[PDB]
Amino acid sequence: MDPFLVLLHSVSSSLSSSELTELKFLCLGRVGKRKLERVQSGLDLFSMLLEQNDLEPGHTELLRELLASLRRHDLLRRVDDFEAGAA
Amino acid sequence: MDPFLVLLHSVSSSLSSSELTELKFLCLGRVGKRKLERVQSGLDLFSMLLEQNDLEPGHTELLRELLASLRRHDLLRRVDDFEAGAA
Amino acid sequence: MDPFLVLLHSVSSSLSSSELTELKFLCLGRVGKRKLERVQSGLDLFSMLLEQNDLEPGHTELLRELLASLRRHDLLRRVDDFEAGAA
Amino acid sequence: MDPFLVLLHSVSSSLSSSELTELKFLCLGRVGKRKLERVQSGLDLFSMLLEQNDLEPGHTELLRELLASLRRHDLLRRVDDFEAGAA
Amino acid sequence: MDPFLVLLHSVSSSLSSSELTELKFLCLGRVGKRKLERVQSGLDLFSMLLEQNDLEPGHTELLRELLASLRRHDLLRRVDDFEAGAA
Amino acid sequence: MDPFLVLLHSVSSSLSSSELTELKFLCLGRVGKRKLERVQSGLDLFSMLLEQNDLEPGHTELLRELLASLRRHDLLRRVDDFEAGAA
Amino acid sequence: MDPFLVLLHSVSSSLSSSELTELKFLCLGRVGKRKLERVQSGLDLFSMLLEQNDLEPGHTELLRELLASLRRHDLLRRVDDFEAGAA
Amino acid sequence: MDPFLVLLHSVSSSLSSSELTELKFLCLGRVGKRKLERVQSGLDLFSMLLEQNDLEPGHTELLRELLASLRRHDLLRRVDDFEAGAA
Amino acid sequence: MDPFLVLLHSVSSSLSSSELTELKFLCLGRVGKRKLERVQSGLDLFSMLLEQNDLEPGHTELLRELLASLRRHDLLRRVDDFEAGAA
Amino acid sequence: MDPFLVLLHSVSSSLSSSELTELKFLCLGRVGKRKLERVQSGLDLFSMLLEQNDLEPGHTELLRELLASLRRHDLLRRVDDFEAGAA
Amino acid sequence: MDPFLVLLHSVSSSLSSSELTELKFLCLGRVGKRKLERVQSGLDLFSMLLEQNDLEPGHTELLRELLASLRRHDLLRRVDDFEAGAA
Amino acid sequence: MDPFLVLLHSVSSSLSSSELTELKFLCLGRVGKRKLERVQSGLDLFSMLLEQNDLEPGHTELLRELLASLRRHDLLRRVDDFEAGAA
Amino acid sequence: MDPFLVLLHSVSSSLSSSELTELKFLCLGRVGKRKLERVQSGLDLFSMLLEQNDLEPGHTELLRELLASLRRHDLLRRVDDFEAGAA
Amino acid sequence: MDPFLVLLHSVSSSLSSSELTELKFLCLGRVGKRKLERVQSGLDLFSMLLEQNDLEPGHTELLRELLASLRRHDLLRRVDDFEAGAA
Amino acid sequence: MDPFLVLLHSVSSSLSSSELTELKFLCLGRVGKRKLERVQSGLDLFSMLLEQNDLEPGHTELLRELLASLRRHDLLRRVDDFEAGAA
DSSP states (O other): OOHHHHHHHHHHTTOOHHHHHHHHHHTTTTSOHHHHTTOOSHHHHHHHHHHTTSSBTTBOHHHHHHHHHTTOHHHHHHHHHHHHHTO | OOHHHHHHHHHHTTOOHHHHHHHHHHTTTTSOHHHHTTOOSHHHHHHHHHHTTSSBTTBOHHHHHHHHHTTOHHHHHHHHHHHHHTO | OOHHHHHHHHHHTTOOHHHHHHHHHHTTTTSOHHHHTTOOSHHHHHHHHHHTTSSBTTBOHHHHHHHHHTTOHHHHHHHHHHHHHTO | OOHHHHHHHHHHTTOOHHHHHHHHHHTTTTSOHHHHTTOOSHHHHHHHHHHTTSSBTTBOHHHHHHHHHTTOHHHHHHHHHHHHHOO | OOHHHHHHHHHHTTOOHHHHHHHHHHTTTTSOHHHHTTOOSHHHHHHHHHHTTSSBTTBOHHHHHHHHHTTOHHHHHHHHHHHHHTO | OOHHHHHHHHHHTTOOHHHHHHHHHHTTTTSOHHHHTTOOSHHHHHHHHHHTTSOBTTBOHHHHHHHHHTTOHHHHHHHHHHHHHTO | OOHHHHHHHHHHTTOOHHHHHHHHHHTTTTSOHHHHTTOOSHHHHHHHHHHTTSSBTTBOHHHHHHHHHTTOHHHHHHHHHHHHHTO | OOHHHHHHHHHHTTOOHHHHHHHHHHTTTTSOHHHHTTOOSHHHHHHHHHHTTSSBTTBOHHHHHHHHHTTOHHHHHHHHHHHHHTO | OOHHHHHHHHHHTTOOHHHHHHHHHHTTTTSOHHHHTTOOSHHHHHHHHHHTTSSBTTBOHHHHHHHHHTTOHHHHHHHHHHHHHTO | OOHHHHHHHHHHTTOOHHHHHHHHHHTTTTSOHHHHTTOOSHHHHHHHHHHTTSSBTTBOHHHHHHHHHTTOHHHHHHHHHHHHHTO | OOHHHHHHHHHHTTOOHHHHHHHHHHTTTTSOHHHHTTOOSHHHHHHHHHHTTSSBTTBOHHHHHHHHHTTOHHHHHHHHHHHHHTO | OOHHHHHHHHHHTTOOHHHHHHHHHHTTTTSOHHHHTTOOSHHHHHHHHHHTTSSBTTBOHHHHHHHHHTTOHHHHHHHHHHHHHTO | OOHHHHHHHHHHTTOOHHHHHHHHHHTTTTSOHHHHTTOOSHHHHHHHHHHTTSSBTTBOHHHHHHHHHTTOHHHHHHHHHHHHHTO | OOHHHHHHHHHHTTOOHHHHHHHHHHTTTTSOHHHHTTOOSHHHHHHHHHHTTSSBTTBOHHHHHHHHHTTOHHHHHHHHHHHHHTO | OOHHHHHHHHHHTTOOHHHHHHHHHHTTTTSOHHHHTTOOSHHHHHHHHHHTTSSBTTBOHHHHHHHHHTTOHHHHHHHHHHHHHTO
């Protein structure tokens, strides 16, 4: 099992619909309107971001910024834990 | 008919919205945020707890603690009555 | 016209969505999760139970317990009327 | 009748659409995108994993990790029961 | 044009999806499951019933019973009007 | 007219596409992948099993197991009826 | 260029698949079942009707009745326009 | 670009769901029940009315009556403006 | 013009591809696999049955059984009408 | 790479299903009903308009009116950008 | 190399199967049914029309009519371009 | 085994149906309509481009442009890696 | 009448063209390419094998391996019955 | 009976049509276009590769590469088992 | 061995049936109808073109035009390579 995929699934499991709507708005300039209409969970958005090289196991700045905008520091702690064991 | 399922349905039919809201808070660390958003009655929460082996016909400690936090001893009497006929 | 099918259709037409949700919970141990996801009315559940021989024109015990758990004695009266004419 | 195939069919019968979507995300690096698009049930994914030697009657680690990600311990109990009679 | 076919087309044009689903349940014992899976409108079911001699221009009892189960008396009036001109 | 062929045709006429997909999965170890691709109904699979001597008029345990996995006991009743008349 | 053929092609270009399915039902008594299975557009049905002398450049009653059953009066206006220039 | 189509699109853009529900009730005797189930915006109803020759660029009585039943005089002013430039 | 051949041609012209596939399965023990491979319509199967004396103008029980297995009673009525004039 | 085709692809990637439905209504008099049924994205409609010479690299008035009806001035800015580099 | 033949080949290479079916219907009165059954591409139809003197390098009226019926003006432009260099 | 063919196969295995539809649109001016109708996977389009010398092991600019239009940078990384081992 | 020839003709009568193609591949090293091109039925291949002493009435090993590779045990039963009566 | 031919037949029996299409693409530089058009199963391609000495009983690297490109490790296990007894 | 004949045979080996059909159409004015009926490969057409002095080792313009009409530039590269070593 890929640890990065497990971390992304765990992060997606802790989001509500309002937070997903907030995240889709902040990715207006990165993902096209037609593609964003098919996003119904965090997993779809994360897959799209992975395909565009916006999200990588060694580059998580965009994810950290998105989680900081939501003011979800508990999830930032999980992201911090992932990078410490992957060094 | 499953006696455990009948007992759970009977317990769920005796709860109000405020008690359900308090129950969803006490299960913050057990059920994820996304799954908890779909709970509109006690039946959904009990089903998710059954799927995770938190609630079992021979293991009812979690149910008893949840009912005791609500100060609902009449429902605890029903739970005790269930275990007497299932000894 | 099948009298049993007519009775089942009439019973299904007298149920609300909350009652259907309650009925799907009481059949957790009889129908799989994937199959239960496709139930949008009492007719689907009744067809599934007919296929498994849980429901028969000569054996209506499960229907009676399911209707008694919902505290719907008016529908139990219809079920009683069906069996009196089918003697 | 192959007991492994019976167990896999039983596991597939107890999953919902959201669980299948979660399972397809966790296999992003194992199955290609064109193949993953044709997956409409757990049986398709299980067949694809069997053909790649990821899933075997004597090697169930990947299945156990996937079920642990879904927090489905009742199905992990079935997997445990399978290996006790297949020892 | 056939007056009976025109009447059947008119009746099919005044039905909703729920009414069609109710009609397919009431014909469980008359049409097989595989055949009933291809029914997407009243025309398909009516043609299948015509092939089995369940529906004829001179025998409309089954149509009347099915419409009475749906509580659609406006369509029963059309069926009555058809027979008066065909005497 | 062969009663065994009539029984097989009647059983095949009572299956849906999802049940056919489930049946093709349980016969993965008996029929090759290339042959399984041409199966569009129960009749094709039944003829393939007849050619391989897996299904015989006096040898029906495989059919019974396949029907029991699908939880189709109404068809198992038909199979039981066939064997009593052929005793 | 045949004006009648041009008119038929124009009429066929303005129909949907549901309208074609409705048209095939109203021609049950005119065209055989085996022939009707090969109809994928209005052109095929029009060709079959031409071969049987049901549709002629000087006799368009059946076409008008079929268009009136579909409540397509805009196409009836074109059919009216054809006979004015062909008088 | 057709001015009539532009005007119809502009009128449809100024309607809420309640107004659409009211408009579908007032067209009960003109459009069949099966077709009305597919109406999700004013554009669908307007297309259906255009096909039946109820709505034409030179005949807007039905549109005016429907808009007057909704007490939407600002849209009636737009309709008046369209006919003024079309004289 | 042979009336029996005319009747067989009329019956063959009222069958679909799926019904032909069903018919070829019920003749598994009567016609060899190599011969059954070239059957593309009811006429070929009828010719093969005629050459084997399975079908005769005064011997139509096999035809009636095959039509009854398809649940095509309208064609059985044609078969009955043929025998009435051939007495 | 064709700059015009790249521009059309970019425009099609920025539209939703409602906008596509609005665009299909405004082209009622330009594309036949049968052809419009196959349009599931903006690319289909754009290719259809290209084949009819309604859309050309040096003739873009129709696209401008269609975008102005949707009130999408951001896409009109892209169209303006395309023609500046093609002067 | 014949410019007329290369023009016809280029026109035939820009047509789909539906357009070919549309073309074959409009030539019902020009080519017999037996000959039209062998047309699998525009080249066959063009050869048949050349042999009948319906199509000549100095007479392209039928080609233009057929292309206008298909609403393919991009091909009409190619036809116009051919006649400019052939003057 | 050809590394270029292996790379093309790997790229084709990582595409969905929508991306294939988008790719067929961007090749409108390179491949004819009749040939484009037979494309059901990326391999067919790649073979067609190879036959026209649009794609070569030493000339991959068109492939890079096509992948950049689809915003698939992970595949562009594979293309970059291929040229590194082929220098 | 030779019983061995009768058995071989009976076996050849029960094979399809696909099985013949598979049989011709398994005899690649036994029969030359030019002779194998003249094989259109099992009879021709069996005659060639008889001429080469590969198949004899007292030595049927090769036939048994060929029938076992095809997974045709029903024909192996016929071969078994032939040897019992030839003892 | 040749073990190598038996292994090749067994491998060909476990392939689908899509996998054959992928295999034919990877042999573009090895087999001519005219010969590849006659390939309808793995047996034909294997025969062509055997005639060119690309495949030999003591030289199976090309087969292993083709199976690894398809990600079919279960077939690679069969290839490994063949060489174990042929050492 | 004649290099011109080798090149012609190699070019013929790289053409499909559809390309041969297109080639026969472009040679309508050069080869008679009866002679063109005997062409089943490129070799026959090339032989007849050689006999008529249309194709010569020092005069290959017709071959180049035919290959350019097919958009086969890879074959044009082989033609170019032949003329370089034959200078």
